[PDB]
């Protein structure tokens, strides 16, 4: 009481905010993420210094920190898999990570590890901590996805390349050695499993061909790489998910549909709407900004409403569901991108344009219909609210080239000088484009571009990339595209682009009035700049 208490109770007060403090006064801490960075560092350091007798942890401590104790107790080993949409037992590596905390090597004579679980599990965790749970290959489960990626890397053209590859897998070393486990037909006939390999490869390839990730001729024996398989590999997408994206994505695919297609992804197969959370979920499904055609019975409605929530950063009470949603954003990014990639390849102007936003929306954790002053981390919270409610066009604020003027529109003086500086750091382009008919069928387009922002390294990074499309008059058909990467040495100075595009027969006979040429920031909201490309006086040769 004499030694600790003044040294504890000094330290207990200073940085402690929550209910954590009434615990720390008692010498027991808590430690999880989503807890103040200073607050968890106190916990670590007080426990380290003998003052806390008991730190109660989420699992992160086990990978993150180096904070040992003599004793480590796992309470319970029940964990929630959002992937599997279900509760489950601690994995072995988690338990072994956790138990690596037990026993201070320098100080303690020994260490103690206590697992607490249902009797059913005890046998299992015994095996884990006592060198008796075997390490076995799951390579078949992901075989189709992983084969495709080597097919896409062009190291497989014929299925002998495939059965050689498989020889460098763990599966293979492990099949030779316990063929009964891996359900080999007959090792003695198959030798080093040459027919087995070939057979796996076959079945794999056929399901791939079935889904248009590859081109396969069994008879001939030629493996070939599709553009769609090439997306699946590059963006690390499940073959099944590429299938859904294949069938469902359309020239007439719509925002409301995208959310559905997104939610159809294999990655979210197990997501289920559990009875308890359903009441809360219904509350959100009826305040949903983008219509949901699907029922609240349907799993798809959950994934959809969850993703719409992440875009609006909705506060969630249930732990179950909050884990679920997290699982969604960490995949949302690269799925929505795979979706975008397909639509761009296929030419569909309008869904491509929309997907690009969803991608932005999932980076920036916000919706399109928000002025991007909110996108600068370095803006105050009140100032944007006054620029959103007013209704003045976003671009309207950008036009003013005077630091006083920008401040008058805000209606604040000191925020008006700092926001002027921010404004100048918002990306913008100038585009001009004339066209030159090379032949009747072939038109060359000559573009001149200036990039107009002032570079800041914290706000822009090493580069800001920019999608350039030339699209038909309807604005539905992407005729050319290319991505421009602007860098600090590029801004301010003019450059030129040229490209050819071959007019369709229709347009060859009657030139349309114009095409469009558009530049969109991959990263920065409402930095799109498009101009009409006239064919007014033109004679095609």
């Amino acid at each position: 009481d004499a030694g600790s208490k003044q040294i504890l109770k000094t330290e207990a007060a200073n940085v402690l905010d929550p209910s954590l403090r009434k615990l720390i006064e008692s010498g027991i801490g808590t430690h999880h993420a989503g807890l103040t960075r200073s607050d968890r560092s106190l916990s670590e350091d007080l426990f380290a210094d003998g003052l806390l007798q008991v730190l109660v942890c989420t699992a992160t401590l086990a990978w993150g920190v180096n904070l040992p104790a003599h004793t480590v107790i796992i309470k319970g080993t029940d964990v929630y898999s959002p992937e599997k949409g279900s509760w489950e037992q601690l994995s072995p590596q988690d338990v072994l990570q956790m138990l690596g905390r037990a026993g201070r090597p320098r100080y303690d004579t020994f260490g103690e590890g206590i697992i607490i679980t249902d009797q059913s599990n005890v046998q299992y965790y015994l095996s884990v901590l006592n060198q008796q749970l075997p390490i076995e290959s799951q390579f078949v489960s992901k075989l189709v996805d992983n084969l495709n990626a080597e097919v896409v890397a062009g190291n497989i053209k014929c299925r002998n390349d495939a059965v050689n590859w498989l020889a460098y897998t763990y599966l293979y070393v492990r099949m030779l050695a316990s063929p009964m486990l891996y359900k080999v037909p007959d090792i003695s006939s198959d030798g080093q499993l040459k027919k087995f390999r070939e057979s796996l490869v076959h079945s794999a390839l056929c399901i791939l061909k079935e889904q248009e990730l590859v081109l396969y001729d069994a008879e001939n024996d030629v493996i070939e790489a599709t553009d769609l398989g090439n997306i699946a590999s590059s963006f690390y997408i499940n073959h099944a998910s590429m299938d859904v994206y294949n069938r469902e994505l359309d020239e007439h695919t719509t925002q409301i549909d995208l959310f559905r297609i997104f939610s159809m992804s294999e990655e979210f197969k197990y997501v289920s709407v559990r009875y308890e959370e359903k009441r809360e979920l219904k509350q959100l499904l009826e305040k949903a900004p983008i219509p949901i055609r699907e029922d609240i019975d349907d799993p798809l409605a959950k994934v959809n409403v969850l993703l719409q929530s992440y875009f609006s950063q909705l506060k969630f009470e249930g732990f179950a569901l909050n884990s679920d949603i997290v699982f969604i954003h960490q995949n949302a990014g690269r799925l929505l991108r795979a979706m975008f990639e397909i639509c761009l390849k296929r030419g569909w102007g309008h869904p491509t344009r929309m997907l690009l936003n969803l991608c932005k929306s999932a980076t920036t954790k916000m919706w399109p219909t928000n002025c991007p002053l909110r996108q600068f981390k370095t803006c105050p919270v009140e100032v944007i609210k006054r620029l959103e409610a007013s209704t003045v066009p976003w671009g309207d604020y950008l036009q003013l080239e005077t630091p006083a003027e920008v401040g008058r529109a805000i209606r604040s003086e000191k925020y008006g000088k700092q926001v002027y500086d921010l404004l100048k750091r918002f990306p913008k382009m100038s585009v001009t484009c004339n066209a030159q008919p090379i032949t009747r069928s072939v038109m060359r387009f000559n573009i001149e571009i200036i990039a107009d922002w002032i570079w800041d390294m914290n706000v822009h990074g090493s580069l800001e990339p920019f999608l350039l499309m030339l699209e038909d008059t309807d604005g539905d058909s992407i005729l050319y595209y290319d991505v421009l990467f602007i860098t600090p040495d590029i801004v301010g100075h003019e450059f030129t682009l040229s490209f050819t595009y071959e007019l369709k027969q229709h347009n060859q006979n009657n030139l349309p009035p114009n095409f469009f040429l558009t530049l969109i920031s991959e990263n920065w909201w409402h930095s799109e700049f498009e101009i009409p490309v006239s064919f007014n006086g033109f004679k095609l040769p």
Partner: protein, 619 residues
Amino acid sequence: PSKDDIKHTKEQLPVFRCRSQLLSLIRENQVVVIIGETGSGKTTQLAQYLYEEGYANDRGKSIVVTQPRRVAAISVAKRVAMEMQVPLGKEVGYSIRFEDVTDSECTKLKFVTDGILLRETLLDDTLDKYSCVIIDEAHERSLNTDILLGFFKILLARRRDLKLIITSATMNAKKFSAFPQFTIPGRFPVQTIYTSNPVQDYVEAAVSQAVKIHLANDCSSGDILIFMTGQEDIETTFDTLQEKFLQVYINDIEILPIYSALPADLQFKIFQDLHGTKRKIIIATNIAETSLTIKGIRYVIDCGYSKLKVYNPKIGLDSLVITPISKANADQRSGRAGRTAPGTAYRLYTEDTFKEDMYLQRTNLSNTLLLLKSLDVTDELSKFPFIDKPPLQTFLSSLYELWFIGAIDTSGQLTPLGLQMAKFPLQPSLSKILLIAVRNGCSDEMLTIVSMLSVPQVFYRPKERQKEADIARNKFFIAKSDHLTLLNVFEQWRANNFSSHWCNKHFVQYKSLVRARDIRDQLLTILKSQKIPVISSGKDWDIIKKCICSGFAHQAAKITGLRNYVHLKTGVSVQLHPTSALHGLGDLPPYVVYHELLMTSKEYICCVTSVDPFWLMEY
């Protein structure tokens, strides 16, 4: 507990059913447009909801105000303080001519007259720190209301971060669209009659008597609320009614007159409850038209007339003129009836009913042009997307008036004089004279006189009382000048502060002295904010009264015998107003300047001040 009871109460009012839809719409839009029944809560509760949904998710706000009339500002400020369980200068506070009870800076909500916020727009051409104005009684088409639209439309095109609100119970939806609406369903009902022969001379005292006998054959307990046009027809009708009662017939009825000029205690007696079987029978002007909730009123009437004030530009002639009301005035009047029980209204509405004919909402545009060109809304006035500005004729009077004043240059662009004047909550003629009064070093007496030629009447005149009492006339002392009666009254009043008693003892109207004080100290504070030298300093009463000639500057008079006049705008024949100090004598300088020219049964000239030939000749 008292505040949690106030909460419970609030959560029964009709507008509470919409509070989240409302709050979303405001947050999402520069502009809004509440529409909702008379008593529904729109006043009391909208700015509560805005303040609250800062204060309850860690934020702060500001705000501003609900409606046009002094009595509404003060009264529904004092209400909303009670519905917060706070004293007025915490989150309450008002600001009116001659009276102010400021709020703290920060959270806090700011209940003002229209004209006062116009004056405050001089120190902020941006009206900033103010998150959220409100809108109150928008359908009272007063020149200040219509000016403050023009300025707010332009502000919201500059400063999206700002929020408006709009608000009435009686308002053209189509007109609002032209200039998100939110409809608030629910109150009591008000059953409305229409007289059924030409209402041609509309204190048909026959119609009045017979209606009050009918609404006394129905044994329905409640108070009546007639609406009349001014003190003349209030005093004739009330007196006539009393005479008829003696002839046809207190221990059944009490008549009560309600006009801006009556003693403040008599005004407060409208809202008080009469003995046992005594029905209370208000005879009021448009000061009871809007916002109020006279508990007890079941049974309106409505003579369908008001007291307008009517410039002509080409000859520079003002005139009071009895005019048909507008459908919006009719609707507001009727709304006084079904706030606390079911009511009736009795629209004495046939001829100029033609109700169809009755204009939905007529006013000189010059002040509103200055706001359109001081927010830089800068195309031009006549391509402002009004509503109205209505007639092109009145537009070109206002542009020519600003041009001749040197508020506008050769290009139609504001001068520094014009910018300053657009920030003063005055007439621009009065703003010009105020700047001449700040040079001279006479600003403070000019400020009193400009405020006084923008305020309710200052003397109290009993019922039929044909003139001032000779105490009130011996507030001018020597100088035949209404303007110096009203100064000597204001000096003396500002000392007393036992000032209900001082007012009583000198027959002066307490809330006109307070309004005039407040107007004077606002116009001084806006002066100082626009970087000016005040003072007062020598034979200033002479330089000052001279300056009055340039602030009301076609308003010059002759005197051609007892109570007979002669406007120096070609020789027309007028009468000194029976309220004036100069309502009888031979005096010393036959030239007067006046504040108003007022059509009645003759033309009459109002607040006068005798002014020497040199004063008329060089301002």
